[PDB]
Amino acid sequence: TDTIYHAKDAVQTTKPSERKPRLVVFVVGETARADHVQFNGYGRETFPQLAKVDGLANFSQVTSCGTSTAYSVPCMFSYLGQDDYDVDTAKYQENVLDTLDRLGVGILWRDNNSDSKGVMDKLPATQYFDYKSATNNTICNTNPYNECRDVGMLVGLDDYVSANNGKDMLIMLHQMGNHGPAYFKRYDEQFAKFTPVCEGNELAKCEHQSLINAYDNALLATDDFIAKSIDWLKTHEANYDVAMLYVSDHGESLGENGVYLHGMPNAFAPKEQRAVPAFFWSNNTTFKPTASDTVLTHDAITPTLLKLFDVTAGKVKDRAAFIQ
C-alpha cells in the first residue's frame, strides 16, 4: 500500500463483548512544562482542579521526543521509539491508531491546535474534525480574540458514544494548550488569576514575571479542561471502563539564558523544552499506573494505549508504559 507495517501481529486478547467496553480520552497537550506543575514542585497551584481528583496519577520524570509540534506528535503515536524515530518518513509508518482502528476500536481525532501531523492520514476523513473554526467548535465567542476554546471539543461526544454503542473507543483531543508567543490569548477571563501579564509582541521586551503569569494562567485553563474531561468520562462509568491520559508534546523556554519559544534541535535544546507533564486517571483499579518518578519518555505512549485496549503486539512488549 506504500505503508510500512510494524504490528501486523497485533491481537486484541479480550473484546468489547467479552468484558466491559472501554472508553478512553487521550488529551494531546502543547507547550506545557513539567517544572510548572505543582505535583512536580512548582510553587503555584496551577492544576487546582486535578489536585482534588481521586485516582489521578502524576508522572514527574517524562521527557518529550522532540521540541516542536511537528516532530513530537508523530513520534507520540509511533512504534519506533525516539532513537529509531525518523520524522521525514513518519507519515508512512503504521502507527498505534492505525493498529487500533484495524482491531475494531473507534478512533476519533478532534483538533483545536493545528493538524494531526499525519497521524490520522490513513484513516477515513470522517474521523478527523477541525475544531479551530466555529464550523465545529461551538465555543469561539467567549473572548475578544474570538479564538475557539479547548472545551468546545467536549461538546457533542455523547452522540459519538451513542452511535458507536458497545464499542471500544479512543478519543484524541488536540489542545491549543499553552502555544504561541501570545500566551494571554490562550485562556478566558475565568483563568486570569495571575497579574500582570504580557501582551507584547516581543517576549524579550516583557517583564519576566508577566510572562510567567500568562503562562500559568494558560496552565489553569488546561487544568480545567482536563478536569472537565474526567467528569465527562465519569458520566459513562456505568456502561464503560473509562480512562484519561494527558501528555504534552514538548516544553517551552521563558527567557532562561535569553531563550524564548521552542523549536531548538534536541542536541542543543535546554532542559525546559523537553520536560513535559503526564497525567493518567482511571475510574477503576482495572489499570494500575507505574510509579510516579519512573524515568519515561514519549515512547511510553504507544504501549500504554495498547495496554488499555488489551492489545498484544510483539514490538512493544519490552517497552515501559504508564500502566502495569
Q: How many residues would you count in the chain? A: 324
Binding-site size, Zn ion (CB under 5 A): 3
- Cβ atoms within 10 Å of 64's Cβ, excluding its own: 28
Residues 230 to 289: which contact Zn ion by CB under 5 A? 249
Residue with smaller CB distance to Zn ion, 21 or 177: 177
One-letter amino acid identity for 202? E
How far apart are CB 30 and Zn ion at their closest, in Å?
4
In the complex, least distance from residue 316 CB atom to Zn ion, rounded to whole angstroms: 24
Q: Which amino acid is at 188?
A: D
Tell me whether residue 69 or residue 229 sits nearer to Zn ion (CB atom).
69
What is the DSSP annotation of 175-186? --TT-SS-GGGS
Whether 183 and 219 have beta carbons less than 8 Å apart is answered as: no
Contact between 36 and 42 (Cβ < 8 Å): yes
- Name the closest residue to Zn ion (Cβ): 69
Closest approach of Zn ion to the CB of residue 180, in Å: 10
* Cα gap 130→100, rounded to integer Å: 22
Is 237 marked as binding a ligand?
A: no
Q: Compare residues 211 and 311 and give the one whose CB is closer to Zn ion.
A: 211
Residues in region 62-91 near Zn ion by CB under 5 A: 69
28 or 107: whose CB is closer to Zn ion? 28
Among positive and negative, which fits the CA dihedral 260, 86, 84, 277?
positive
What's the min distance (Å) between Cβ of 32 and Zn ion? 9
Does the annotation place 30 within a ligand binding site? yes
Residue 69 known to bind ligand = yes
Nearer to Zn ion, 6 or 262 (CB): 262
Report the nearest approach of Zn ion to the CB of residue 302 (Å): 19
Instruction: Decide whether 22 or 179 has the Cβ nearer to Zn ion.
Output: 179
Residues 21-40 that bind Zn ion (CB under 5 A): 30
Query: Is there a contact between 172 and 154 (Cβ–Cβ < 8 Å)?
Result: no
| Among candidate residues 191, 267, 268, the one with its CA nearest the CA of residue 228 | 191
Last residue before each gap in the chain (C to N over 2.5 A)? none
| Rounded CA separation 229/238 (Å) | 16
User: Interacting stretch for Zn ion, rule CB under 5 A, among 61-69, 129-137, 294-302, 310-318?
Assistant: 61-69
Question: 217: which 3 cell numbers?
Answer: 494562567
Cis peptide before 289 (omega within 30 of 0): no
d(CA 108, CA 73): 16
113 binds Zn ion (CB under 5 A): no
Tell the smallest beta-carbon distance from residue 250 to Zn ion (Å).
5
Q: Which of 244, 232, 324 is nearest to 282 (CA)?
A: 244
Residue 249 in marked binding region: yes
Q: Name the minimum Å distance from CB 319 to Zn ion.
A: 23
Q: Which of 6, 172, 132, 148 is nearest to 80 (CA)?
A: 6
Which CB sits closer to Zn ion, 65 or 100?
A: 65
> Residues marked as binding for Zn(2+)?
30, 69, 249-250
Which residues sit at the interface with Zn ion, rule CB under 5 A?
A: 30, 69, 249
> Residues marked as binding?
30, 69, 249-250
